[PDB]
A and B are shown apart, each in its own frame.
Chain A
Amino acid sequence: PGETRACGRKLISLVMAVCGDLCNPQEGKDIATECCGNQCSDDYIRSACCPH
């Protein structure tokens, strides 16, 4: 729980950098919440917000 404080902010920055305009912000907030509570794979994190 202490670690999670930065985690959501860090994942969302990564996701927005990977997708750019293709990623809806509140949808990325969900990726961050899901992946900061449970270990996700590299494959999921990078493509969840923009699979195309």
Chain B
Amino acid sequence: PAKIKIVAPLESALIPGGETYQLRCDIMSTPAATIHWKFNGKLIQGSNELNVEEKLLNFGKAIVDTGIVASILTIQCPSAENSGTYSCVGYNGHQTIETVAEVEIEGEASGCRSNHKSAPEIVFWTDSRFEMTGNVATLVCRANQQVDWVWMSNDELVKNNDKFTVLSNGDLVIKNIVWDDMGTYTCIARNQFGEARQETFLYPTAHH
């Protein structure tokens, strides 16, 4: 049965202009949730898209698909253009949850250089994913720019084979999971400007 839950709603904030400010929301959800952000009701980050390809690979199976996803929104050079209503929206195809906060900027940002030629950021990721042994699972990372992806599992490189698939969007697809696949999976995003890393966690639950 579908469940979706915010871990901690956004708080209203008065913030100094010109200084980078970061919002975060964590969402627990069954099945997997996607997160997107709105500014005064308009989408500014993320998407509504769900992982339908994994639902295909598990079509006909009993699916556990539970865990927590996390996402960050970075306001680089907070000016008056950035004062308004910030919204984090969680979505899992059956349910939607939304937490909304007012951000007011005090001051301007004349000095601020913004994220020109700045390292990539990982703005959305699977914090934990639970799935039943024998099913396909996916660990998600998304970056704010075009990047190349490299995945590690418990300090070992992940290469494409019959089990693992590193998709170019930042998904790690893991077929036919078994208890030994449990642990931390590290996504590394690179471009010409730097790299960002983020840890995800997979728990293969018991088959009954």
Q: Which residues of B contact A39 (CB under 8 A)?
A: 133, 179, 182, 204-206
Size of the A side of the interface (Cβ < 8 Å), in residues, is 20
Q: Which residues of B contact A10 (CB under 8 A)?
A: 127-128, 201, 203
Of the residues A6, A40, A42, contact of B66 by C-beta under 8 Å? A42
Of the residues B5, B155, B201, contact of A6 by C-beta under 8 Å? B201
Extra contacts, 5 of them, besides A7-B182, A39-B205, A45-B203 (Cβ < 8 A), are A10-B201, A13-B127, A13-B128, A14-B67, A46-B66
Residue of B nearest to A5 (CB): B184
Give me the interface of B with A, judged by CB distance under 8 Å: 3, 5, 7, 28, 64, 66-68, 127-128, 130, 132-133, 154-155, 179, 182-184, 199, 201, 203-208
Report how far A18 CA is from B165 CA in the complex, Å.
30
Q: Does B184 contact A6, Cβ atoms closer than 8 Å?
A: yes
In the complex, what's the smallest C-beta–C-beta distance from A40 to chain B, in angstroms? Answer: 6
Inter-chain contact count A-B, CB under 8 Å? 64
In the complex, what's the smallest C-beta–C-beta distance from A14 to chain B, in angstroms? Answer: 6
In the complex, what's the smallest C-beta–C-beta distance from A30 to chain B, in angstroms? Answer: 17
Q: Does B67 contact A40, Cβ atoms closer than 8 Å?
A: no
Residue of A nearest to B208 (CB): A41
In the complex, what's the smallest C-beta–C-beta distance from B136 to chain A, in angstroms? Answer: 16
Report how far A24 CA is from B24 CA in the complex, Å.
25
**A–B Cβ pairs within 8 angstroms, 15 of them:** A3-B182, A4-B183, A5-B184, A6-B184, A7-B182, A10-B127, A10-B128, A13-B127, A13-B128, A14-B28, A39-B133, A39-B182, A41-B205, A41-B206, A42-B64
In the complex, what's the smallest C-beta–C-beta distance from A10 to chain B, in angstroms? Answer: 4
Q: For the complex, would chain A's binding face be called helix, strand, loop or mixed by DSSP majority?
A: helix
In the complex, what's the smallest C-beta–C-beta distance from B46 to chain A, in angstroms? Answer: 20
Convert A7-38 into 0s and 1s, putting 1 for each residue whose CB lies closer than 8 angstroms to a CB of B: 10011011001100000000000000000000
Report how far A34 CA is from B155 CA in the complex, Å.
24
Q: Which residues of A contact B179 (CB under 8 A)?
A: 39
Q: Does A14 contact B130, Cβ atoms closer than 8 Å?
A: yes
Residue of A nearest to B206 (CB): A41
Q: Does B68 contact A17, Cβ atoms closer than 8 Å?
A: yes
Q: Does A14 contact B66, Cβ atoms closer than 8 Å?
A: yes
Q: Does B130 contact A13, Cβ atoms closer than 8 Å?
A: no
Q: Does A2 contact B64, Cβ atoms closer than 8 Å?
A: no
